[PDB]
Structure formats: structure tokens, C-alpha cells
Amino acid sequence: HVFRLKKWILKVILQFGE
């Protein structure tokens, strides 16, 4: 499911997304 974008790189993008 495309919500795997949690776990996978990290996102990483999520870590840099604020």
C-alpha cells in the first residue's frame, strides 16, 4: 500500500518535511 512511504527509505522525505 502506498502508505509504505513510512518505513522504506525512511520516507526519508517525512524527516525533512516540516
Side-chain angles (χ1 to χ4, degrees), residues 5-9 11-13 15-18:
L5 276 263
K6 277 164 171 173
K7 48 172 154 181
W8 80 322
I9 295 288
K11 196 164 180 166
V12 283
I13 313 310
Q15 280 164 311
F16 307 95
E18 304 196 294

